[PDB]
C-alpha cells in the first residue's frame, strides 16, 4: 500500500530571538544560495560586533591653560554614558540592548610645544572619586603626562562594577569617571602659546551585550 504525501500541519520557525508557532503550516521555499564575490565590492572586514563596537571614538575635548591651578580638574567624564550617544556607531548596538558588561581602553593625548612645561594626570576611577586623596590618584589605572617627555597615555581596564552589567537606558551609577587634573602647573616663557588643547579616545573591549529592547529611555 502506497502512502501519499500530505503537508505537515504544525511546525516551529524563527531566528535569533524570535520564535513562531504555526498550526496550518507548510514548507519553506528557497532559491539559489549564498554567493561569494570572486571580486569583492569592498575590502573592509564585513561589519561585526568588534568592527562597529570595539573601536575608538572621540569622547570629549578641552583646553589646559596657564591659568589652571594645581589639581584643577580639566575634565570629569562618565566615559560609558558619553559613548552612549547617536554621535558614535557603537550606539547602534547599545541603543537596542538593555544591559552589557565590558572592559575599556582609553587614550588621552595633547600637544604642548617644547617651550611649555608642566604636566597632568589621567585616572580611571570606578563610580566616583568620593573623597580619595587627589595626591594618590596614581593608584587608579593611570597615565602621567609631562611636557618635556610624552604627549600621550593609554589605559586599559576590564569590567569593574557592583552589578553584573551596566544598564544604558537608565543607569544606576557611572561605571567609570575618568578624571584629568593638573599634576604640575603649566607655566611658560613670555610669548609662547598659553594653552594646549586635549582630546580623549575611548572604546569598549570584550563587549558583551544582553537583552534586545525597543526602549530608548
Amino acid at each position: 500500500e502506497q502512502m501519499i504525501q500530505s503537508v505537515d500541519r504544525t511546525a516551529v520557525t524563527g531566528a535569533s530571538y524570535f520564535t513562531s508557532v504555526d498550526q496550518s503550516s507548510v514548507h519553506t521555499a528557497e532559491v539559489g544560495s549564498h554567493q561569494i564575490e570572486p571580486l569583492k565590492t569592498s575590502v573592509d572586514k564585513p561589519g561585526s560586533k568588534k568592527t562597529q563596537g570595539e573601536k575608538f571614538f572621540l569622547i570629549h575635548s578641552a583646553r589646559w591653560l596657564t591659568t589652571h591651578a594645581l589639581f584643577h580638574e580639566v575634565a570629569k567624564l562618565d566615559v560609558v554614558k558619553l559613548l552612549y550617544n547617536e554621535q558614535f556607531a557603537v550606539q547602534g548596538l547599545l541603543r537596542y540592548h538593555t544591559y552589557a558588561r565590558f572592559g575599556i581602553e582609553i587614550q588621552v593625548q595633547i600637544n604642548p610645544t617644547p617651550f611649555q612645561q608642566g604636566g597632568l594626570i589621567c585616572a580611571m576611577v570606578p563610580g566616583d572619586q568620593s573623597y580619595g586623596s587627589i595626591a594618590s590618584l596614581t593608584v587608579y589605572p593611570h597615565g602621567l603626562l609631562n611636557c618635556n617627555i610624552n604627549n600621550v597615555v593609554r589605559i586599559k581596564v576590564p569590567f569593574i562594577y557592583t552589578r553584573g552589567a551596566y544598564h544604558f537606558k537608565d543607569p544606576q551609577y557611572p561605571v567609570w569617571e575618568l578624571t584629568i587634573r593638573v599634576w604640575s602647573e603649566l607655566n611658560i616663557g613670555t610669548g609662547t602659546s598659553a594653552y594646549t588643547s586635549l582630546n580623549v579616545l575611548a572604546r569598549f573591549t570584550d563587549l558583551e551585550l544582553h537583552g534586545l529592547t525597543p526602549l530608548s529611555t
Binding site: 504525501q5 500530505s6 503537508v7 520557525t13 524563527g14 531566528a15 503550516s25 507548510v26 519553506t28
Partner: protein, 263 residues
C-alpha cells in the same frame, strides 16, 4: 541555517533553473501500469509541488530528428535579433543610440520585439554582445563607429545631429572605420565595460536611468552629398557564450510587447 535561524520543516529549492533539456531525448515508460501518485498534490507547499506530475500511462517519447536543442538560450539568442534602425538626412552628421534593457523605453526609442522580450525574462545581465549592423542605400560613404560605456561623455541619444566630440576622444574609446562601397555590413563585439556588476530591464525611473544600460553605439557618416540616395542603418544583436543570465522574472505581459512595425 548559518544565519542563526532555525526551523522544524524543511526548505527545498523552488523553481530551479535549467531543469530539463529542450529536445525530445532520453536523458520502458515515462509513467504507467503502477499508480499515478503525482496526479495529486498541495501546490501551496513548495516541496510537494515539485512532486513529478503524472496522470496517465505514457511511453518514452524517443529521439528528435534535429541535432541541436532550440531551447538553449545561447543557441536561440545566438540568432542575432533585431534592435533598431535610423536614416541620415544631411552630410557630416552622426547618430548615437543606447543599448537599454529598459522595459519602459518604448521603441523606436527603445528595445523592440524579441530583444525586448528576452531581456525581461530575467533580472540581471552581464557579458559581451556581438553586434552586427547592416548598411542600406548609399555608396562610397565613409563611416565610423564607436562603443561608449555607461557613464561617459557621448552625443545626445536617439538624435541625428552634428557631433560635439573631439575626433581624438571618439577614436580613443576604440573605434572602426568603413566604406559603403567596399562592405555594407559590420559585425563587431561589444565589451562588458561597466562599473556595475550587471544591468537590468525591469527597474524604476532612477535606476532605470543608470543600471539599465549595457552601453552606447555611435555611427558618424561623411562624404554623403544628399544628391545621392538615402542612407539607412539597421542594427541587430546576438548574445555570446561569455554572456550570463541571472534570476528568472515573470515574462512581460503581452500588452507591453511592442514591435517597430515597418517592413
Amino acid at each position: 541555517d548559518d544565519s542563526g535561524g532555525f526551523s522544524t520543516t524543511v526548505s527545498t529549492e523552488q523553481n530551479v533553473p535549467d531543469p530539463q533539456v529542450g529536445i525530445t531525448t532520453m536523458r520502458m515508460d515515462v509513467s504507467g501500469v503502477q499508480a499515478p501518485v503525482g496526479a495529486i498534490t498541495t501546490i501551496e507547499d513548495p516541496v510537494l509541488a515539485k512532486k513529478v506530475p503524472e496522470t496517465f500511462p505514457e511511453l518514452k517519447p524517443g529521439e528528435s530528428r534535429h541535432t541541436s536543442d532550440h531551447m538553449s538560450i545561447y543557441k536561440f539568442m545566438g540568432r542575432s535579433h533585431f534592435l533598431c534602425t535610423f536614416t541620415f538626412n544631411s552630410n557630416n552628421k552622426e547618430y548615437t543610440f543606447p543599448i537599454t534593457l529598459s522595459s519602459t523605453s518604448n521603441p523606436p526609442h527603445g528595445l523592440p520585439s524579441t530583444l525586448r522580450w528576452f531581456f525581461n525574462l530575467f533580472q540581471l545581465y552581464r557579458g559581451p554582445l556581438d553586434l552586427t549592423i547592416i548598411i542600406t542605400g548609399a555608396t562610397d560613404v565613409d563611416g565610423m563607429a564607436w562603443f561608449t560605456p555607461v557613464g561617459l561623455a557621448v552625443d545626445t541619444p536617439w538624435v541625428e545631429k552634428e557631433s560635439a566630440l573631439q575626433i581624438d576622444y571618439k577614436t580613443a574609446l576604440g573605434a572602426v572605420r568603413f566604406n559603403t562601397r567596399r562592405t555594407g555590413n559590420i559585425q563587431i563585439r561589444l565589451p562588458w565595460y561597466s562599473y556595475l556588476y550587471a544591468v537590468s530591464g525591469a527597474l524604476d525611473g532612477l535606476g532605470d536611468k543608470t543600471d539599465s544600460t549595457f552601453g552606447l553605439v555611435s555611427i558618424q557618416i561623411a562624404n554623403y552629398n544628399h544628391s545621392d540616395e538615402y542612407l539607412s542603418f539597421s542594427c541587430y544583436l546576438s548574445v555570446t557564450e561569455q554572456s550570463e543570465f541571472y534570476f528568472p522574472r515573470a515574462p512581460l505581459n503581452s500588452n507591453a510587447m511592442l514591435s517597430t512595425e515597418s517592413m
